[PDB]
Amino acid sequence: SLPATFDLTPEDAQLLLAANTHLGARNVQVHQEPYVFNARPDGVHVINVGKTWEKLVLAARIIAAIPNPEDVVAISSRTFGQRAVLKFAAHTGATPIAGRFTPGSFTNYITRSFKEPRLVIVTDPRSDAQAIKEASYVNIPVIALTDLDSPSEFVDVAIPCNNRGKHSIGLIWYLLAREVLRLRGALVDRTQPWSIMPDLYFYRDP
Amino acid sequence: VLVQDLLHPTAASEARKHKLKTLVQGPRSYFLDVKCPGCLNITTVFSHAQTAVTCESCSTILCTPTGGKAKLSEGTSFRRK
Amino acid sequence: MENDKGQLVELYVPRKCSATNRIIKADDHASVQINVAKVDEEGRAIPGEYVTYALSGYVRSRGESDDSLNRLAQNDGLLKNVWSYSR
Amino acid sequence: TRSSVLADALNAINNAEKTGKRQVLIRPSSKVIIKFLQVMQKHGYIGEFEYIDDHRSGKIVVQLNGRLNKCGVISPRFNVKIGDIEKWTANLLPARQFGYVILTTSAGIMDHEEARRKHVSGKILGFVY
Amino acid sequence: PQAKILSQAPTELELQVAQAFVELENSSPELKAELRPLQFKSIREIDVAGGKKALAIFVPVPSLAGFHKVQTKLTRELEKKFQDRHVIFLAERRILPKPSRTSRQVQKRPRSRTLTAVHDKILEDLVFPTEIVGKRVRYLVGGNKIQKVLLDSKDVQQIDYKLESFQAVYNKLTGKQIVFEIPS
Amino acid sequence: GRMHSAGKGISSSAIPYSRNAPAWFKLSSESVIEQIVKYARKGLTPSQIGVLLRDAHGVTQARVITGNKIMRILKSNGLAPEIPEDLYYLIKKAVSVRKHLERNRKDKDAKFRLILIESRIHRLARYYRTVAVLPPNWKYESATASALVN
């Protein structure tokens, strides 16, 4: 759909250089991701550094598919997360499901926190192994948020980042949404900032 | 997949798939017009040698044969064709 | 199926998966038939008017369906992208 | 080897179609086969089918409907006399109506009901339903 | 000179064609030098869809070399010296029937002397400077018959436009249905 | 899948489609004729000729560039060799093996392999019976190979 500025502006090399999301992993590059800029002679994979605005914001019209965002969730079971996916559930649509996922919650009429979706998502496809399977079932599209690491069979699109500690798990959904909302919803159209921080967004208690 | 054009698929899916299945078969190896530095001469070498060829006559050496592709010496422009 | 003189002589005509022109044989359960929908020229769901289509059991089992529809309402006249006849 | 051709591709066509492949690819192309499909097609059982040449014995794409029920090759290729096909139909055609047994004469790499209107018979390669 | 460069005896359209040949060896040096001995059979006009003719040459055979040597010039002076016109190059090839049963031995056929062969050659020399890359063929529910022809994506400007015509010229000669494709 | 073991190998050449010319090559057909016929007396084998032709000069196959298939050409010129070349490496292997069996009668692996090999040959020798390219009767004889080459 080429537009205008969804395009990089005066700051999209300044703010993820203090947070690391171009980075890949140790001795590990998984055949299953265009989603690694080369690969250096001293250590480590400099994830291609132009194509995540390609399949982390398919990933935003596909919905735009929600008539009702609390179905638009965030999938998880980590520590640094339970403070970004809980939370993708607050500022817009979604039952949080971090911690308990709630196994079944997508197999099988017999449980508790009830599911019957049409594009769910998924932090770590090593922690979230059941949007690849609770989908290879019956009729529930999925979307993995595909590091150098994500069995790609049946989570049909790419969502790459970096999770070896630190922030960017949570602080990355944030971008699924902002830019899903700037198709359909209620915020505002080059810029008039955006009233939080990426330094609310981090821990709650260690 | 319930279906697909296998006529023409992607360009992708060929580059990787094996020489003898891109449908119509075609080679990978291809030829490579070499200036040894001394002479201007230009010898038409093959990517998979088996032979090292000498350059024209200067008696020079060129390109050793290994598993598949020559390893060419230092001097050699090796423009492809 | 019919007689000498135009008398449909049957129990019924079977319904046939919509992308797979097999058959749907009575007691399938697995069995769906969709009712998506259309917008009217406006965020309003058009009423008493919809699309249709019809899954076997056949393919529910095989992952299939998600990619079978994502051929078809792009292939029909509503959706744009996701899908490719050239993989 | 591959000792026989038509067979090989046919079997894969009743093993595409079973699974609901909408199509196929098959290797060694013949005339024989080109002709075979050209019969099948006339009778409403496949479509289009987009030879491909490669200067070789060659590859052929066969786009689907999902009608095909079943098209085994027979296979010595026996002999046959006119009034004999009247034994075959009912030993490998569900009905009669319908669904063509199919054979190879002289014209003709052409079924039996057309065979009446010609009054000819020789050897019987495949069969459709 | 020119009746000379006719290779038969008769003759109306040929003698202007012979004239424009004996004119380029007259006018252009570099061109007599190659062209001088290059003899031909007869010509055949053949109509195309959008009004526009097509100038059908027929070759003795041998020089198909001679002719290919200087086609990609020759045509260009000719397309100007004749209008509308599409000038082509193809050979006249001694096809033959298949021996029946009551038939006979003669001696054979020498494969390349068979309907498809010739039809393959007719190919090579309907285009020419492009080189064939990839063939393809359709078979539709009215036993269609359609060849896709695959082209190389280089020098298709030598001529493109032609094309609309090409399809036709390969139609009168044969009774067929031909298409092209530039692949990406 | 190789006719003697448990082995299903795949690996040949993916002659390329183009029948005519390389175009990028612009030298002459005569040119390589000369070259092969240059090579032959020296001490050739058609198998090798191409290799040598390929790796150094224009060529791509003799085949494009001429309307023949090396051999054909040597045969016109009379350089075919008394033997069909592929054979003259098998028999060779015979001598070269049998000899080794006889320094060390306490070797089976080798033995078998010999046979195996006697057999490659008879079958290939039955073919270069059939088609007029071994004077009828030829039969292979274990011991007569050492003044047939040296």
mmCIF file of N, CA and C in Angstrom, chain A residues 58 61-62 118 135-142 154 156, chain C residues 55 59-63 65-67 69-70 80 82 87:
data_model
loop_
_atom_site.group_PDB
_atom_site.id
_atom_site.type_symbol
_atom_site.label_atom_id
_atom_site.label_comp_id
_atom_site.label_asym_id
_atom_site.label_seq_id
_atom_site.Cartn_x
_atom_site.Cartn_y
_atom_site.Cartn_z
ATOM 1 N N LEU A 58 0.400 -7.578 6.280
ATOM 2 C CA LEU A 58 0.558 -8.872 6.947
ATOM 3 C C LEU A 58 0.365 -8.778 8.446
ATOM 4 N N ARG A 61 -3.019 -5.135 8.963
ATOM 5 C CA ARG A 61 -4.124 -4.874 7.980
ATOM 6 C C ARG A 61 -4.977 -6.191 7.862
ATOM 7 N N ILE A 62 -4.239 -7.290 7.720
ATOM 8 C CA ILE A 62 -4.554 -8.657 8.168
ATOM 9 C C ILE A 62 -5.550 -8.773 9.318
ATOM 10 N N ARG A 118 -9.174 -15.726 15.042
ATOM 11 C CA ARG A 118 -8.867 -15.729 13.553
ATOM 12 C C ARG A 118 -7.488 -15.106 13.108
ATOM 13 N N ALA A 135 -3.025 -23.948 15.836
ATOM 14 C CA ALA A 135 -3.193 -23.317 14.521
ATOM 15 C C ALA A 135 -2.993 -24.346 13.417
ATOM 16 N N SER A 136 -1.974 -25.173 13.603
ATOM 17 C CA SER A 136 -1.822 -26.392 12.846
ATOM 18 C C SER A 136 -2.881 -27.398 13.367
ATOM 19 N N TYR A 137 -4.167 -27.086 13.150
ATOM 20 C CA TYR A 137 -5.327 -27.757 13.822
ATOM 21 C C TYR A 137 -6.438 -27.774 12.770
ATOM 22 N N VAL A 138 -7.031 -26.584 12.558
ATOM 23 C CA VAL A 138 -8.460 -26.433 12.195
ATOM 24 C C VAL A 138 -8.886 -25.122 11.484
ATOM 25 N N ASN A 139 -8.416 -23.939 11.937
ATOM 26 C CA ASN A 139 -8.761 -22.595 11.344
ATOM 27 C C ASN A 139 -8.515 -21.325 12.228
ATOM 28 N N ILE A 140 -7.296 -21.175 12.766
ATOM 29 C CA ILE A 140 -6.883 -20.038 13.686
ATOM 30 C C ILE A 140 -5.651 -19.116 13.420
ATOM 31 N N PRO A 141 -5.540 -18.489 12.220
ATOM 32 C CA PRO A 141 -4.254 -17.851 11.889
ATOM 33 C C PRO A 141 -3.414 -17.320 13.072
ATOM 34 N N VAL A 142 -2.094 -17.313 12.885
ATOM 35 C CA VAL A 142 -1.137 -16.942 13.931
ATOM 36 C C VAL A 142 -0.174 -15.907 13.358
ATOM 37 N N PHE A 154 3.931 -22.889 9.840
ATOM 38 C CA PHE A 154 2.546 -22.649 10.334
ATOM 39 C C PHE A 154 2.270 -21.371 11.173
ATOM 40 N N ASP A 156 2.715 -18.506 9.701
ATOM 41 C CA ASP A 156 2.976 -18.027 8.328
ATOM 42 C C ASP A 156 3.726 -16.655 7.940
ATOM 43 N N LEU C 55 -16.620 -26.436 4.100
ATOM 44 C CA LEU C 55 -15.475 -27.308 4.253
ATOM 45 C C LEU C 55 -15.935 -28.721 4.482
ATOM 46 N N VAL C 59 -10.177 -31.889 5.346
ATOM 47 C CA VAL C 59 -8.912 -31.167 5.393
ATOM 48 C C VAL C 59 -8.644 -30.424 6.709
ATOM 49 N N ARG C 60 -9.598 -30.462 7.648
ATOM 50 C CA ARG C 60 -9.586 -29.605 8.863
ATOM 51 C C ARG C 60 -8.249 -29.597 9.624
ATOM 52 N N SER C 61 -8.268 -32.338 8.093
ATOM 53 C CA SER C 61 -7.392 -32.477 9.238
ATOM 54 C C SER C 61 -6.075 -31.705 9.084
ATOM 55 N N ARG C 62 -5.718 -31.402 7.834
ATOM 56 C CA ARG C 62 -4.320 -31.322 7.395
ATOM 57 C C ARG C 62 -3.623 -29.954 7.465
ATOM 58 N N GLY C 63 -4.138 -29.056 8.311
ATOM 59 C CA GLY C 63 -3.701 -27.669 8.273
ATOM 60 C C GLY C 63 -4.436 -26.953 7.153
ATOM 61 N N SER C 65 -7.085 -25.887 5.446
ATOM 62 C CA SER C 65 -8.155 -24.902 5.294
ATOM 63 C C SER C 65 -7.709 -23.436 5.356
ATOM 64 N N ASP C 66 -6.889 -23.088 6.349
ATOM 65 C CA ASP C 66 -6.431 -21.700 6.527
ATOM 66 C C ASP C 66 -5.836 -21.141 5.246
ATOM 67 N N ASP C 67 -5.083 -21.975 4.536
ATOM 68 C CA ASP C 67 -4.471 -21.564 3.284
ATOM 69 C C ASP C 67 -5.413 -21.774 2.091
ATOM 70 N N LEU C 69 -8.777 -21.083 2.145
ATOM 71 C CA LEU C 69 -9.643 -19.909 2.089
ATOM 72 C C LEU C 69 -8.848 -18.654 1.772
ATOM 73 N N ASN C 70 -7.711 -18.469 2.455
ATOM 74 C CA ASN C 70 -6.859 -17.263 2.291
ATOM 75 C C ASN C 70 -6.492 -16.976 0.827
ATOM 76 N N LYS C 80 -7.561 -8.476 -0.271
ATOM 77 C CA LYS C 80 -6.425 -7.977 -1.034
ATOM 78 C C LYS C 80 -5.161 -8.449 -0.333
ATOM 79 N N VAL C 82 -2.163 -10.959 1.397
ATOM 80 C CA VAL C 82 -1.790 -12.164 2.138
ATOM 81 C C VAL C 82 -1.281 -13.151 1.093
ATOM 82 N N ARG C 87 4.043 -19.396 -5.490
ATOM 83 C CA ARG C 87 4.963 -19.587 -4.385
ATOM 84 C C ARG C 87 6.368 -19.732 -4.960
#
